[PDB]
Design a protein around this ligand. Sequence first.
Ligand code: SAM
Ligand code: SAM
Ligand code: CL
Ligand code: CL
Ligand code: CL
Ligand code: ZN
Ligand code: ZN
Ligand code: ZN
Ligand code: ZN
Ligand code: ZN
Ligand code: ZN
Ligand code: ZN
Ligand code: ZN
Lengths: 257, 259
Amino acid sequence: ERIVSRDIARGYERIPIPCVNAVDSEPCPSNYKYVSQNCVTSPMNIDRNITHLQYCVCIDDCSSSNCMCGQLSMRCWYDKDGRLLPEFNMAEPPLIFECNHACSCWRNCRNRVVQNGLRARLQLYRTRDMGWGVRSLQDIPPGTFVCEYVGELISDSEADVREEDSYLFDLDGEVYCIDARFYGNVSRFINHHCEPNLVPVRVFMAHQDLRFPRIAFFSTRLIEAGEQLGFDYGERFWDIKGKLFSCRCGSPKCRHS
Amino acid sequence: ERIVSRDIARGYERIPIPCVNAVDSEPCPSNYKYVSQNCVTSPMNIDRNITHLQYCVCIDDCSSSNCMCGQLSMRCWYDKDGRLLPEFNMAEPPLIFECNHACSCWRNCRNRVVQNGLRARLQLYRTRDMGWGVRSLQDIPPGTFVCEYVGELISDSEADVREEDSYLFDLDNKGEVYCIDARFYGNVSRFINHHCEPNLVPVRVFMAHQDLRFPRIAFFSTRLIEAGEQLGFDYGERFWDIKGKLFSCRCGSPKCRHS
Ligand SMILES: C[S@@+](CC[C@H](N)C(=O)[O-])C[C@H]1O[C@@H](n2cnc3c(N)ncnc32)[C@H](O)[C@@H]1O
Ligand SMILES: C[S@@+](CC[C@H](N)C(=O)[O-])C[C@H]1O[C@@H](n2cnc3c(N)ncnc32)[C@H](O)[C@@H]1O
Ligand SMILES: [Cl-]
Ligand SMILES: [Cl-]
Ligand SMILES: [Cl-]
Ligand SMILES: [Zn+2]
Ligand SMILES: [Zn+2]
Ligand SMILES: [Zn+2]
Ligand SMILES: [Zn+2]
Ligand SMILES: [Zn+2]
Ligand SMILES: [Zn+2]
Ligand SMILES: [Zn+2]
Ligand SMILES: [Zn+2]
């Protein structure tokens, strides 16, 4: 196992994300630019008018059902450790509205998780037969925020003319996409699994422009130290790529083999 | 001395900014919203195209002569402690271009100070005759980043119809010019009083974008500021051209230019 980078994020995350290769001679991938938060090339005109934000007037730590931001989320789904409650619907997640800079509450209130960024110890590594992948170095309890799907925000019309579509996440009115091909974070290396240990959740933080949810992966179960991360890429991906290759996730319940 | 808030920023800064009143019974100011970063109401159309960033290719910590970002700034003006070099021209500051997310360097490189946020221990306090002011609770060495002038980014045409103009900071022409209004949304800097021999100087800084219409305004210390001293900057001639007919400067400098 060769260490090919001590940190693919170059210090932009809380902790480093090293890259190792125990399989072959490929060096650390360098065909893209690591960015820790979303970017644009062509302008997106995201609504950032501060007076358009809904916000709460809580005098506590936003643990009561009176919190407007919890109400927008149906309820606040976070426990005091920032983990999703047992009742959270992993099969059909709601939208999460975290507290923002317009709220009366403090920056340490209960309804702030994704806005605090990536915390888990992750590693980019060479898989046996699925190129690069991402693993957790430590145990991750169920319902824990793992990482955001970060990249270049683009229009559907722009996605329609992109040659490489293997690093797209659809935000689907007007519809948009996150393309992690040229600019992306660690999430661009996460492989597909049919019984995934991550689920994507649509989250609003500093803006509430519903065209532009941010995509937060939360653990669907206990992820043991060493395990590869995976999420369900969905049907659009497989309708297209199923023509070219079959799923190698190896699940007994694999739906694309 | 009554402590009226342990932190006006509600935990949004690296350190608390308490408010005290040892003069009268005025409560902690509450007729504005504290924001730690600039905001907009009407859209500003800031150029955030990542391919429009100029960036560096440094293989080190950006302390060499060769850093592109330093070159844009004339040279990198920051020493190893994040303080402006002695040669920095306080009377005529250059534009500073800090490193950014398009640069090849690491997040801990030398050319990153303002983007790391407010670090000095500050306090909002009631002054005897100039309302609220801000003081340092610690010694601040010369050339230290103290705080950013944060508020609502507005056009000159919007500034033209803003009745309350006592919390405005004018930005740079280009035939297009903007302002930061800290009246409704602002950080601690909205409370800093004017001084004719100021211990702070505003420096125009670029970080995540390089849209020259929207420099960010970073106050740096012009000298050693002693623990307890009130912070001050020079509001400039436009402020005093307008407000001079309503009141005179009470900074108390023996060289006061607006008394
Ligand atoms: C977003 S990338 C993931 C990172 C990729 N392995 C790499 O090396 O860059 C998606 C691509 O990885 C491969 N891949 C991901 N999951 C897979 C799976 N379950 N079975 C087969 N190939 C997969 C496919 O080539 C797919 O188009
Ligand atoms: C940006 S505010 C500063 C905070 C203000 N003291 C407060 O209590 O909100 C500007 C106002 O403070 C007062 N002020 C600031 N510096 C002053 C000075 N040197 N002399 C007289 N008044 C001053 C004036 O009323 C001025 O319009
Ligand atoms: Cl958190
Ligand atoms: Cl954002
Ligand atoms: Cl910015
Ligand atoms: Zn609340
Ligand atoms: Zn809250
Ligand atoms: Zn809230
Ligand atoms: Zn499968
Ligand atoms: Zn450099
Ligand atoms: Zn740089
Ligand atoms: Zn640098
Ligand atoms: Zn004076």
